[PDB]
DNA sequence: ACAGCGGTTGCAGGT
DNA sequence: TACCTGCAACCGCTG
């Protein structure tokens, strides 16, 4: 009997060849837990285990590099999901393949060397995933590859809100608030099980040349200038995000009564949960994060509510999803269906010295040091600095601070960027222009010391706080007392706010009316 | 039809 | 304190 279970073990050995493939691909949701696309292909696995070999991929696409800017920070974020991520496949038996090259090349070859039966992914609404999804989608017909597609990056489907709003995204979020409440929500999954009878793939042409082909990426292979590190205070993956998670979740009061208009851009510490790196690569589930906001909730009946809650953030972000999926030219001004014509001046110089926090503003200057060091600043300190590029003082298009926090943020979203650009611009959805931040006040209410000015901009740290907000006000004997000339050791002011921003909702109003009269 | 309402997160000067 | 008004007056939705 033990002769003959022998026997039937090393009689299977040559069966296994015989086993097509079920492959995941991970583009975003980069997490084990609620992930549908991945727990189908572990399920459909394990429903007939000796049938089928599992390959979790991730493709590294040249590609991406063609459409968007990417900070060394954020590719440190990146090499470290991927590693925790195999870190959690292979819990479960399995491990994740990091094929590197385009999509359209890759997906060819593997398809017919691991004899694919079926691909499932999270579905993405990115104009970069809509041509590649469609690519491969095309192509495993063509093949013969069955494809499920599964939508878990967010809580609602931007598809369906659309389709019950009529066929057209809700612009407003009141109204987008009105539409899905009337969606359900997905059961909310938890990480799949373990593999059975899973013996590891057999290795193609590839693997055979050369066995580490598909191994994680090292940070010398993904972060070609490590000099634009800084300290790793966001370090990346599903495991880092859900401890995040729990840990931002352990003061239920502080939960319940969260208003966003009340934290602070310039504490030391953030004054939010900063998962939105991790909701962005899909490291956490924004779904389980909202079903965890819900259960708190129940406990804390007295709550905030949207649009300044918890849940109310998380709709934001499944507000500028909507819209975004609507319009591929979501991250532009021309062609895109939402946004205010403006003619915004190029200024190279005024760029370049917002760009590298040389405004002169040490508030403006301070916020974007820190997003340069760290990849993560808060949300009214990106009011702060985009107001600032745009409709407050220079004049310059969102688009070209849109590309700045593309590269930086280590929670660079392209439709979340895009909504948020075209919001401090007053180019869509917000629309009061005179509303306008004030470099010199605005973060003066939350640090009236400066304390966050002396850490990301030194050189000024022994100014008074008395001025240290505005230093142009210092005389030079002063300055010199405080050990920081202007001029020389810090810049010049490039505009003075006082005069600029009063041109410019002059300017916006002009706009304004030209953008009505076309319709 | 177009007035009235509400709109995540303004500032300054004031109660 | 947490809140108010004046400042000029925008948008989309609603009826
Ligand atoms: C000009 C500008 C550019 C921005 N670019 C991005 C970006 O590329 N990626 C990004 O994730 N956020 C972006 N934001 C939105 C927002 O600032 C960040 O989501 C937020 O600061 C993240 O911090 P948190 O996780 O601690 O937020 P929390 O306040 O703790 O909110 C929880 C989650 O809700 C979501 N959320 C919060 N605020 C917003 C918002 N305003 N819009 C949409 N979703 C929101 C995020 O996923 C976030 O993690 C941008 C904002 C501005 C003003
Ligand atoms: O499929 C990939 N997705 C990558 N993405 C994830 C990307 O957001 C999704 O592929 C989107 O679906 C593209 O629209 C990255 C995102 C970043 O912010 C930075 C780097 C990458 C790199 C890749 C990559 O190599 N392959």
Request: hydrophobic share 40%.
């Amino acid at each position: 009997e033990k002769g003959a279970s022998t026997s039937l073990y090393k009689k299977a050995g040559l069966m296994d060849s015989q086993r097509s493939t079920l492959v995941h691909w991970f583009r975003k949701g980069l997490r084990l837990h609620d992930n549908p696309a991945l727990s189908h292909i572990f399920t459909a696995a394990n429903a007939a285990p000796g049938r089928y070999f599992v390959r979790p991929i991730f493709i590294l696409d040249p590609g991406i590099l063609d459409w968007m800017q990417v900070g060394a920070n954020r590719w440190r974020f990146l090499q470290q999901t991927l590693e925790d991520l195999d870190n959690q496949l292979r819990k479960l038996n399995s491990r994740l393949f990091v094929v590197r090259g385009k999509p359209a090349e890759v997906f060819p070859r593997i398809f017919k060397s691991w004899r694919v039966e079926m691909l499932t992914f999270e579905t993405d609404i990115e104009p970069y995933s809509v041509t590649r999804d469609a690519a491969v989608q095309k192509l495993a017909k063509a093949e013969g590859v069955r494809v499920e597609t599964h939508c878990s990056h967010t809580i609602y489907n931007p598809e369906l809100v659309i389709a019950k709003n009529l066929g057209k995204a809700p612009i407003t979020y009141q109204k987008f608030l009105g539409i899905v409440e009337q969606l359900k929500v997905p059961k909310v999954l938890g990480v799949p099980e373990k593999l059975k009878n899973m013996p590891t793939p057999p290795k193609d042409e590839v693997e055979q040349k050369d066995s580490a082909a598909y191994d994680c990426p090292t940070m010398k292979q993904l972060v070609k200038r490590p000099e634009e590190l800084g300290p790793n205070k966001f370090p990346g993956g599903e495991t880092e995000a859900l401890r995040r998670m729990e840990e931002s979740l352990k003061d239920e009061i502080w939960v319940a009564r969260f208003e966003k208009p009340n934290t602070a851009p310039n504490s030391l510490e953030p004054s939010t949960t900063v998962l939105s790196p991790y909701l962005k690569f899909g490291c956490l589930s924004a779904r389980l994060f909202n079903q965890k906001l819900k259960e708190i909730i129940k406990r804390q009946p007295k709550h905030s509510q949207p649009p300044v809650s918890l849940i109310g953030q998380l709709m934001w972000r499944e507000f500028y999803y909507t819209v975004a999926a609507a319009e591929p030219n979501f991250d532009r001004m021309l062609g895109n269906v939402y946004c205010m014509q403006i003619p915004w001046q190029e200024h190279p110089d005024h760029l370049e010295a917002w760009t590298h926090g040389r405004t002169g503003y040490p508030f403006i200057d301070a916020i974007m040091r820190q997003l340069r060091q760290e990849g993560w600043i808060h949300h009214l300190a990106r009011h702060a600095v985009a107001c600032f590029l745009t409709r407050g003082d220079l004049w310059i298009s969102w688009e070209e601070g849109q590309r700045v926090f593309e590269q930086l943020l280590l929670d660079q979203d392209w439709a979340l960027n895009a909504g948020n650009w075209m919001w401090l611009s007053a180019s869509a959805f917000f629309h009061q222009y005179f509303r306008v931040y004030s470099p010199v006040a605005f973060g003066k209410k939350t640090d009236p010391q400066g304390h966050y000015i002396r850490k990301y901009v030194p050189e000024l740290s022994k100014y008074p706080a008395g001025c240290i907000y505005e230093p142009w006000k210092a005389s030079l004997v002063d300055q010199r007392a405080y050990g920081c000339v202007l001029g020389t050791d810090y810049p010049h002011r490039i505009v003075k706010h006082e005069v600029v921003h009063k041109e410019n909702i002059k300017r916006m109003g002009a706009a304004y009316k030209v953008n009505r009269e076309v319709r």
